[PDB]
Design a protein around this ligand. Structure first.
Ligand SMILES: O=C(O)C(=O)CC(=O)c1ccccc1
Ligand SMILES: [Mn+2]
Ligand SMILES: [Mn+2]
Length: 191
C-alpha cells in the first residue's frame, strides 16, 4: 500500500522537515500517503540542504553570537514566489548573475549559488545529468556515502561533508533493514 515507507519517513526525519515536505506535496497536487517514495526523497533533500547550511558563519564554524552572518542563504523549502524573492535580494546585495533555474543555497563567502543534488543512483552519472540541465555550483550526495562537486571544489570542510554522507549512508541501511531500500532506489528515474 505504501504505508511502510510513509511510516518510516515520519520517524526518520524531524517534524519541521516532515511538515515542509507535506506542504510542498499538497501545493502541487501530491498526496504524501500515496507517493511515498517521493515523500522520502523530498524529506532527504531538505535535510541535506539544512545540514549543509548548519553551523556556518562569516568564515567560521559555531555550534551563535549576534554580529555573525550566516554563511548560507537557504532557497529550497520556500514556495516559488518567496524562492525567487530571495534570489532577487541576493542579486541586488552582491551583484551576482541571476540564475535561470532555482538553486538550493547561496554561499556568501564564495559568492555563488549552489545546486544540491541527492541520488540513490551513482553519483557521477547524476552529476553529469544535472550539469547538462544547467555559474551555479553543483554538489551531489549519494545514499552510499559519495559526493561529487564542480571542479573538485567541495565548499565545506571534510567533517561537515562527512556528517551529511554518514546521515545518508545511515538512511540507506535503516531502509535496507526494513526491506525498503531496493524499492526506494528503483523508483528514481534513470538507471
Ligand atoms: O532536484 C533538486 O535537487 C532540486 O533541488 C529541485 C528543485 O528545487 C526544483 C525547482 C523547480 C522545479 C522542480 C524542482
Ligand atoms: Mn531546489
Ligand atoms: Mn537540489
Amino acid at each position: 500500500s505504501g504505508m511502510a515507507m510513509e511510516d518510516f519517513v515520519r520517524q526518520c526525519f524531524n517534524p519541521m522537515i516532515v511538515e515542509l515536505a507535506e506542504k510542498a506535496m499538497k501545493e502541487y497536487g501530491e498526496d504524501p500517503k500515496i507517493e511515498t517514495n517521493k515523500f522520502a526523497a523530498i524529506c532527504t533533500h531538505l535535510e541535506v540542504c539544512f545540514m549543509y547550511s548548519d553551523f556556518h558563519f562569516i568564515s567560521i564554524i559555531v555550534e551563535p553570537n549576534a554580529l555573525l552572518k550566516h554563511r548560507f542563504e537557504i532557497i529550497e523549502g520556500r514556495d516559488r514566489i518567496m524562492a525567487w524573492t530571495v534570489v532577487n535580494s541576493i542579486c541586488n546585495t552582491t551583484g551576482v548573475e541571476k540564475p535561470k533555474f532555482l538553486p538550493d543555497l547561496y554561499d556568501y563567502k564564495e559568492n555563488r549559488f549552489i545546486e544540491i543534488g541527492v541520488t540513490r543512483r551513482e553519483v557521477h552519472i547524476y552529476y553529469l545529468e544535472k550539469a547538462n540541465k544547467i555559474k551555479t555550483h553543483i554538489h551531489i550526495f549519494s545514499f552510499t556515502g559519495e559526493e561529487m562537486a564542480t571542479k573538485a571544489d567541495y565548499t565545506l570542510d571534510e567533517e561537515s561533508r562527512a556528517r551529511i554522507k554518514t546521515r545518508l549512508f545511515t538512511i540507506r541501511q535503516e531502509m535496507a533493514s526494513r526491506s525498503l531500500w531496493d524499492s526506494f532506489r528503483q523508483s528514481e528515474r534513470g538507471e
